[PDB]
Amino acid sequence: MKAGVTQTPRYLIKTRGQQVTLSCSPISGHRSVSWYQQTPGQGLQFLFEYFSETQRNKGNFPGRFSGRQFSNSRSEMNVSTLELGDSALYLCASSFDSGNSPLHFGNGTRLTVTEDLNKVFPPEVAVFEPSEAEISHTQKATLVCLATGFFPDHVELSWWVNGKEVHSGVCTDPQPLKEQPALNDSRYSLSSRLRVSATFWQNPRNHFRCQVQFYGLSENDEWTQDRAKPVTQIVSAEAWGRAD
Amino acid sequence: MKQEVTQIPAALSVPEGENLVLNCSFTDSAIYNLQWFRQDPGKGLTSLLLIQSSQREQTSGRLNASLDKSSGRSTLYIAASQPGDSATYLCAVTNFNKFYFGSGTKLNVKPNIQNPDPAVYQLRDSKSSDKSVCLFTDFDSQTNVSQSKDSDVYITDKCVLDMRSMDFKSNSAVAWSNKSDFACANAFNNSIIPEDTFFPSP
After folding, report:
1. Residue B125 in contact with residue A128, Cβ under 8 Å?
2. Angle CA B64–B77–B42, to nearest 5
3. How many CA atoms lie within 13 A of B186 on its CB side?
4. Is residue A230 less than 8 Å (CB to CB) from chain B?
5. Bond into A9 cis (ω within 30)
6. Count of C-beta atoms within a 10 Å radius of residue B20
7. A130: which chain B residues are within 8 Å (Cβ-Cβ)?
8. A1-115 is a CATH 2.60.40.10 domain
9. Contacts of A244 (CB under 8 A, 6+ apart)
10. Which of A83, A220, B116, B181 is 20 to 30 Å from A103 by CA-CA measure?
11. Mind telling me how many Å the CA of A127 is from chain B's nearest CA?
12. Angstrom distance (rounded) from CA A65 to CA A77
């Protein structure tokens, strides 16, 4: 298969005042590259569009938001003097011609700007094994995975059964819950379910794993707290089937 | 003039199989194209339709959108809705030198639960967790799950799983806490749940 729009990096945590540079590579054959900022509060806001190395159109952002395009159509954007309200999904879209051809979006760079890196925590992850009553009543077995206490919300949760990623029988919450809803820097929790037949759960050779990838601090971020540095990492929990 | 793109409804919940209607309006009729997109949680946007300023409609599969440029309106019609249509739907217009997105319609297409079997189960504790966990499951799609009265009881919203190879879908919500005065019997007490809900003895 051919590449879609690509964006690098995927996830960023920064402190106030810092700067970031983001990159986007358009689909091969697309020369128009556009940037958008998506926030819960303002929705989806145009930054600027490039074609053949020059800015063709611009939105209403202040000058600390800047962009550029290279001869191979790759585009960068930069945000200087970062502020808490700059936390957003920064989306790239490519098009053959934005005037008359569809926009094709990347999956974005997720940026969180925080007051202090001591606010950053990886998830704790646990799997809870099925109810005996569910198994007797329905001949089905639901496992729950909880990922709790994380900040920022830069997580990807997945289920693996005997080493294979599964989507059948899974449902993961679309958004996390705030553990302390009143606070701007509240930590988050996320739940997911995996449901299998009772017969499948009852085989002790079947192995279940809930994986949470957490995207955290860089090796270049200073860390002087006693607790472990909250670097990018996977936190996982597992179970095996049980005959009784 | 200042372009303003408005989308209604902000949110739409409907049973699968129903047709649905999504509305977009734009105050400045001097547009070059109108586009409709969908966006899933944790992803970018997918282009569904592009209607040129000279066109009155576009169709793709179950989707049909009209454009009335002089009236400042587009309607997106989705026939025979499916659970996989659930997404945020965004309207955008291309102006001479600007681009504008509406605020979106968040669409949830609910599964028809053929044999509801509402129940609240307790899952086994984890030797690596200190939480007690409860699962409300197998209820019909008309059931609404509410948040707890208690600030240290956490309740998720209903989530639909599909056991593909058994052609079986089910709703569930999870509740958990690490307080000690907590019981799965009472975890969902702030929700209106079916009177026939099964509460197994513990």
Report:
1. yes
2. 95
3. 8
4. no
5. yes
6. 18
7. 121, 123-124
8. yes
9. none
10. A83
11. 7
12. 7
**B71: number of Cβ within 10 Å:** 10
> Count of CB contacts below 8 A, A vs B?
147
Residues of chain A contacting B160 with CB distance shorter than 8 Å: 171
Nearest-CA distance A29 → chain B (Å): 17
Give me the amino acid identity at B139. F
The answer on B89 and B118 residing in a single domain is no
Residue at token pair 């409609």: B57
How far apart (Å, rounded) are the C-alpha atoms in residues B105 and B90?
7
Alpha-helix runs per DSSP H in chain A: 132-138, 198-201
Q: Choose the CATH number for A116-244 among 1.25.40.10, 1.10.3860.10, 3.40.50.150, 2.60.40.10.
A: 2.60.40.10
Nearest by CB: B200 against A102, A133, A237: A133
Tally of CA atoms within 13 A in the half-sphere of B79 that contains its CB = 7
Q: Which residue has the tokens 């965004």?
A: B90
